[PDB]
Design an enzyme around this catalytic site. Structure first.
Site, PDB file in Angstrom:
ATOM      1  N   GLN B 166       7.293  12.346  -3.853  1.00  0.00           N
ATOM      2  CA  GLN B 166       7.398  13.773  -3.556  1.00  0.00           C
ATOM      3  C   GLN B 166       8.454  14.403  -4.482  1.00  0.00           C
ATOM      4  O   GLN B 166       9.591  13.924  -4.567  1.00  0.00           O
ATOM      5  CB  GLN B 166       7.721  13.995  -2.069  1.00  0.00           C
ATOM      6  CG  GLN B 166       7.101  15.260  -1.449  1.00  0.00           C
ATOM      7  CD  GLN B 166       8.025  16.484  -1.491  1.00  0.00           C
ATOM      8  OE1 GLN B 166       8.898  16.591  -2.349  1.00  0.00           O
ATOM      9  NE2 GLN B 166       7.827  17.412  -0.555  1.00  0.00           N
ATOM     10  N   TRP B 233       5.905  15.887   9.828  1.00  0.00           N
ATOM     11  CA  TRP B 233       5.114  16.211   8.638  1.00  0.00           C
ATOM     12  C   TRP B 233       3.736  15.554   8.640  1.00  0.00           C
ATOM     13  O   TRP B 233       3.157  15.277   7.588  1.00  0.00           O
ATOM     14  CB  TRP B 233       5.912  15.949   7.357  1.00  0.00           C
ATOM     15  CG  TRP B 233       6.981  16.987   7.185  1.00  0.00           C
ATOM     16  CD1 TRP B 233       8.314  16.840   7.431  1.00  0.00           C
ATOM     17  CD2 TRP B 233       6.793  18.350   6.788  1.00  0.00           C
ATOM     18  NE1 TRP B 233       8.973  18.019   7.193  1.00  0.00           N
ATOM     19  CE2 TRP B 233       8.063  18.965   6.798  1.00  0.00           C
ATOM     20  CE3 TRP B 233       5.673  19.109   6.416  1.00  0.00           C
ATOM     21  CZ2 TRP B 233       8.250  20.302   6.447  1.00  0.00           C
ATOM     22  CZ3 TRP B 233       5.859  20.441   6.071  1.00  0.00           C
ATOM     23  CH2 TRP B 233       7.140  21.024   6.088  1.00  0.00           C
ATOM     24  N   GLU B 236       1.926  12.792   6.361  1.00  0.00           N
ATOM     25  CA  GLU B 236       2.995  12.332   5.489  1.00  0.00           C
ATOM     26  C   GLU B 236       4.040  11.486   6.211  1.00  0.00           C
ATOM     27  O   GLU B 236       4.589  10.549   5.629  1.00  0.00           O
ATOM     28  CB  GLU B 236       3.652  13.531   4.819  1.00  0.00           C
ATOM     29  CG  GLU B 236       4.596  13.175   3.689  1.00  0.00           C
ATOM     30  CD  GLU B 236       4.837  14.351   2.783  1.00  0.00           C
ATOM     31  OE1 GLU B 236       5.872  15.030   2.939  1.00  0.00           O
ATOM     32  OE2 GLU B 236       3.972  14.611   1.929  1.00  0.00           O
ATOM     33  N   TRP B 275       1.611  21.639  -7.940  1.00  0.00           N
ATOM     34  CA  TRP B 275       1.348  22.278  -6.646  1.00  0.00           C
ATOM     35  C   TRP B 275       0.919  23.732  -6.837  1.00  0.00           C
ATOM     36  O   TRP B 275       1.534  24.478  -7.611  1.00  0.00           O
ATOM     37  CB  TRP B 275       2.607  22.325  -5.770  1.00  0.00           C
ATOM     38  CG  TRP B 275       3.305  21.022  -5.446  1.00  0.00           C
ATOM     39  CD1 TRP B 275       3.228  19.839  -6.127  1.00  0.00           C
ATOM     40  CD2 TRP B 275       4.244  20.810  -4.380  1.00  0.00           C
ATOM     41  NE1 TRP B 275       4.043  18.900  -5.541  1.00  0.00           N
ATOM     42  CE2 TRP B 275       4.679  19.469  -4.467  1.00  0.00           C
ATOM     43  CE3 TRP B 275       4.757  21.624  -3.359  1.00  0.00           C
ATOM     44  CZ2 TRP B 275       5.600  18.918  -3.567  1.00  0.00           C
ATOM     45  CZ3 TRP B 275       5.669  21.077  -2.461  1.00  0.00           C
ATOM     46  CH2 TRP B 275       6.078  19.734  -2.571  1.00  0.00           C
TER      47      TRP B 275
HETATM   48  C1  LIG Z   1      15.021  19.745  -0.611  1.00  0.00           C
HETATM   49  C2  LIG Z   1      14.087  20.506   0.089  1.00  0.00           C
HETATM   50  O1  LIG Z   1      14.421  20.953   1.187  1.00  0.00           O
HETATM   51  N1  LIG Z   1      12.888  20.709  -0.461  1.00  0.00           N
HETATM   52  C3  LIG Z   1      11.816  21.506   0.172  1.00  0.00           C
HETATM   53  C4  LIG Z   1      10.488  20.748   0.057  1.00  0.00           C
HETATM   54  O2  LIG Z   1      10.561  19.523   0.789  1.00  0.00           O
HETATM   55  C5  LIG Z   1       9.311  21.596   0.566  1.00  0.00           C
HETATM   56  O3  LIG Z   1       8.089  20.884   0.329  1.00  0.00           O
HETATM   57  C6  LIG Z   1       7.466  20.481   1.551  1.00  0.00           C
HETATM   58  O4  LIG Z   1       8.105  19.234   1.942  1.00  0.00           O
HETATM   59  C7  LIG Z   1       7.527  18.610   3.109  1.00  0.00           C
HETATM   60  C8  LIG Z   1       8.348  17.337   3.394  1.00  0.00           C
HETATM   61  O5  LIG Z   1       9.714  17.683   3.663  1.00  0.00           O
HETATM   62  C9  LIG Z   1       6.033  18.314   2.856  1.00  0.00           C
HETATM   63  O6  LIG Z   1       5.888  17.327   1.817  1.00  0.00           O
HETATM   64  C10 LIG Z   1       5.278  19.591   2.452  1.00  0.00           C
HETATM   65  O7  LIG Z   1       3.940  19.272   2.062  1.00  0.00           O
HETATM   66  C11 LIG Z   1       5.967  20.284   1.274  1.00  0.00           C
HETATM   67  O8  LIG Z   1       5.306  21.524   1.009  1.00  0.00           O
HETATM   68  C12 LIG Z   1       9.289  22.952  -0.166  1.00  0.00           C
HETATM   69  C13 LIG Z   1       8.222  23.879   0.421  1.00  0.00           C
HETATM   70  O9  LIG Z   1       7.891  24.874  -0.548  1.00  0.00           O
HETATM   71  O10 LIG Z   1      10.570  23.636  -0.061  1.00  0.00           O
HETATM   72  C14 LIG Z   1      11.694  22.869  -0.538  1.00  0.00           C
HETATM   73  O11 LIG Z   1      12.856  23.665  -0.327  1.00  0.00           O
HETATM   74  O1  LIG Z   2      -6.802  24.648   7.275  1.00  0.00           O
HETATM   75  C1  LIG Z   2      -6.783  23.698   6.492  1.00  0.00           C
HETATM   76  C2  LIG Z   2      -5.699  22.821   6.452  1.00  0.00           C
HETATM   77  C3  LIG Z   2      -5.697  21.795   5.507  1.00  0.00           C
HETATM   78  N1  LIG Z   2      -6.798  21.558   4.708  1.00  0.00           N
HETATM   79  C4  LIG Z   2      -6.814  20.404   3.764  1.00  0.00           C
HETATM   80  O2  LIG Z   2      -5.754  19.507   4.050  1.00  0.00           O
HETATM   81  C5  LIG Z   2      -4.809  19.486   2.989  1.00  0.00           C
HETATM   82  C6  LIG Z   2      -3.379  19.400   3.526  1.00  0.00           C
HETATM   83  O3  LIG Z   2      -2.922  20.657   3.985  1.00  0.00           O
HETATM   84  P1  LIG Z   2      -1.836  21.515   3.154  1.00  0.00           P
HETATM   85  O4  LIG Z   2      -2.102  21.403   1.704  1.00  0.00           O
HETATM   86  O5  LIG Z   2      -1.856  22.925   3.606  1.00  0.00           O
HETATM   87  O6  LIG Z   2      -0.464  20.764   3.510  1.00  0.00           O
HETATM   88  P2  LIG Z   2       0.833  20.912   2.579  1.00  0.00           P
HETATM   89  O7  LIG Z   2       0.671  20.083   1.353  1.00  0.00           O
HETATM   90  O8  LIG Z   2       1.010  22.339   2.202  1.00  0.00           O
HETATM   91  O9  LIG Z   2       2.019  20.458   3.334  1.00  0.00           O
HETATM   92  C7  LIG Z   2      -5.116  20.729   2.160  1.00  0.00           C
HETATM   93  O10 LIG Z   2      -4.745  20.606   0.807  1.00  0.00           O
HETATM   94  C8  LIG Z   2      -6.612  20.840   2.325  1.00  0.00           C
HETATM   95  O11 LIG Z   2      -7.259  19.934   1.454  1.00  0.00           O
HETATM   96  C9  LIG Z   2      -7.871  22.441   4.754  1.00  0.00           C
HETATM   97  O12 LIG Z   2      -8.853  22.302   4.012  1.00  0.00           O
HETATM   98  N2  LIG Z   2      -7.854  23.499   5.647  1.00  0.00           N
END
Ligand SMILES: CC(=O)N[C@@H]1[C@@H](O)[C@H](O[C@@H]2O[C@H](CO)[C@H](O)[C@H](O)[C@H]2O)[C@@H](CO)O[C@H]1O
Ligand SMILES: O=c1ccn([C@@H]2O[C@H](COP(=O)(O)OP(=O)(O)O)[C@@H](O)[C@H]2O)c(=O)[nH]1
Ligand SMILES: CC(=O)N[C@@H]1[C@@H](O)[C@H](O[C@@H]2O[C@H](CO)[C@H](O)[C@H](O)[C@H]2O)[C@@H](CO)O[C@H]1O
Ligand SMILES: O=c1ccn([C@@H]2O[C@H](COP(=O)(O)OP(=O)(O)O)[C@@H](O)[C@H]2O)c(=O)[nH]1
Ligand SMILES: [Mn+2]
Ligand SMILES: [Mn+2]
Lengths: 287, 287
Positions: B166, B233, B236, B275
């Site tokens: 990540q 999460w 994850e 992303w």
């Molecule tokens: C250091 C910090 O706080 N970074 C955060 C990111 O973690 C965050 O990303 C999200 O992180 C969660 C796990 O913690 C998960 O992986 C989500 O999919 C991911 O989007 C990010 C969000 O834009 O903000 C940062 O500040």
């Molecule tokens: O309403 C939803 C929620 C999730 N997803 C699928 O599940 C994945 C994980 O969700 P998301 O990306 O929103 O999680 P994030 O990475 O932002 O934490 C997405 O990329 C999509 O592929 C989707 O199709 N519809």
């Protein structure tokens, strides 16, 4: 090395033509050992391609039925890619594919006359062979959309260059065949010549062979245009001339492309593919 | 037989972590010899799968960009099958695919909560592996749709079980990781434990390993539901618990899944995937 005797037994169908004078098999139900071929090809890890064109109302009438039956019956147990050529991808029917099938769709330009839609396929297939198909598959079949798979159409049909016996003419003499008989056409075959009447609705082979088939047919189509002539059965006329000059290494029986309007005579033991009823009033937009 | 040293050179990137304590490589730009792997894998005739879900507004927002970029960058020079799961197959955008790409589409049920849409993928992926994917591909990646390929994402990423670092946490101390810290959850990881923080947006491996990854994750998800708890999460949290117990045989650096909101520091030499910016207000309909 695969030999003919490994999988093909002509004596199982003694009442029909099973061998050509150039020693190519004619594949009838009963003559093939599919289990032997499935194993042989599985070890080679082959992939098989299938092209199909649906332009205009051919999409709504035939595409779903063709693809649904192809998924069920075509080269089962082996990776298959369906190449779908349509003029309008929004009308493409939504179907679930089973294990070892995948697809890809191309948007093509629709020609004005159905005659040209049908004939331009030869140009288009060649282009796709060069661009990608040669890198994707070991064998390719090119098929009409107005038909439906009825039973297993498998690895017994594979060869270098593969031809289909037209259902209505397989027992006829060459001088009765609806060959193009005008010497001004590139598709011309004289009376006194010809082995079989081949159907343009199914042909195949290795990508190399299919490219040559399609390039030569299209060259004939184009030459005819310059001479203000159009072959009577279009692709089929040109295909028959081609298979006369370059003999197919495998022929399929009418069991592999059967017209039920004939009925069902003794020679037809198990139908693998059937013709759709003609609907020209609807699916075609010109005479 | 392939050896790590055949394709992986840690000394090209001495400023970052290139090896785990269980002797798995962490793949950074500069460490991999793709030419060597491309030849090795081509001789094996491998096929690589890729699963992607788009349910609801994720279809219009992300799917086309994901697929267009994947066609261009993912496992180039090898046969690829895109497995596309959507709730509305009529909304599935159709793009032209290049050589060695094909796909197949499945209509899935939309879950009510976005949390369950996301988490149900684990169950659905496992079902497809058993039904067909195990017969179709040698390796499989499972990816979020809300991202886009930016450069080559090739055979240097293949392995038995593959995890993604990540982007925000790769340099962080494990006791700052957003692991699930409640002991009532199946995804619980105590302080004092953990190797890396893995991103749920990309994971892969052989169909065998991916099945075990997804089955184990889904069992944790269902156990939590019986205990009236939801992991912080979601996928994850469970995926991180899994990879702690069952260590990945290959890890990908943040170059393979980069958040441009971080900016671009010295360590990130060539971005393979980025992303998409979060648009939860529009793409999600609850919580
Ligand atoms: C250091 C910090 O706080 N970074 C955060 C990111 O973690 C965050 O990303 C999200 O992180 C969660 C796990 O913690 C998960 O992986 C989500 O999919 C991911 O989007 C990010 C969000 O834009 O903000 C940062 O500040
Ligand atoms: O309403 C939803 C929620 C999730 N997803 C699928 O599940 C994945 C994980 O969700 P998301 O990306 O929103 O999680 P994030 O990475 O932002 O934490 C997405 O990329 C999509 O592929 C989707 O199709 N519809
Ligand atoms: C004996 C006889 O004339 N039978 C015809 C069929 O030939 C005809 O099929 C058409 O045949 C041409 C070539 O002659 C071409 O293969 C066409 O694709 C095909 O449809 C059939 C049409 O319904 O009618 C029979 O009477
Ligand atoms: O307007 C047309 C004409 C033909 N075709 C394609 O070309 C093939 C050959 O045409 P057709 O089947 O009508 O010829 P026939 O077999 O009836 O003689 C069809 O199956 C279609 O795949 C098409 O898509 N649209
Ligand atoms: Mn036809
Ligand atoms: Mn995501």
């Amino acid at each position: 090395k695969l030999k003919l005797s490994d999988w093909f037994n002509p004596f199982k169908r003694p009442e029909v033509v099973t061998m050509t004078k150039w020693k190519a098999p004619v594949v009838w139900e009963g003559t093939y050992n599919r289990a032997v071929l499935d194993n042989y090809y599985a070890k080679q890890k082959i992939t098989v391609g299938l092209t199909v064109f649906a332009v205009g109302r051919y999409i709504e009438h035939y595409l779903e039925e063709f693809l649904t039956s192809a998924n069920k019956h075509f080269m089962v147990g082996h990776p298959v890619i369906f190449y779908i050529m349509v003029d309008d991808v929004s009308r493409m029917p939504l179907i679930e594919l089973g294990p070892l099938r995948s697809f890809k769709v191309f948007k093509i330009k629709p020609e004005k006359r159905w005659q040209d839609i049908s004939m331009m396929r030869m140009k288009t297939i060649g282009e796709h062979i060069v661009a990608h198909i040669q890198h994707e598959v070991d064998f390719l079949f090119c098929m009409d959309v107005d038909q439906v798979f009825q039973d297993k159409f498998g690895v017994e049909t594979l060869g270098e260059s593969v031809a289909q016996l037209q259902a209505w003419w397989y027992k006829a003499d060459p001088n009765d065949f609806t060959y193009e008989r005008r010497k001004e056409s590139a598709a011309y075959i004289p009376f006194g010549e010809g082995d079989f009447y081949y159907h343009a609705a199914i042909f195949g082979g290795t990508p190399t062979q299919v490219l040559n088939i399609t390039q030569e047919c299209f060259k004939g189509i184009l030459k005819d245009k310059k001479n203000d002539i159009e072959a009577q059965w279009h692709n089929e006329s040109h295909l028959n001339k081609y298979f006369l000059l370059n003999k197919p290494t495998k022929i399929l029986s009418p069991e592999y492309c059967w017209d039920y309007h004939i009925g069902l005579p003794a020679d037809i033991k198990l139908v693998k593919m059937s013709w759709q009823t003609k609907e020209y009033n609807v699916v075609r937009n010109n005479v």
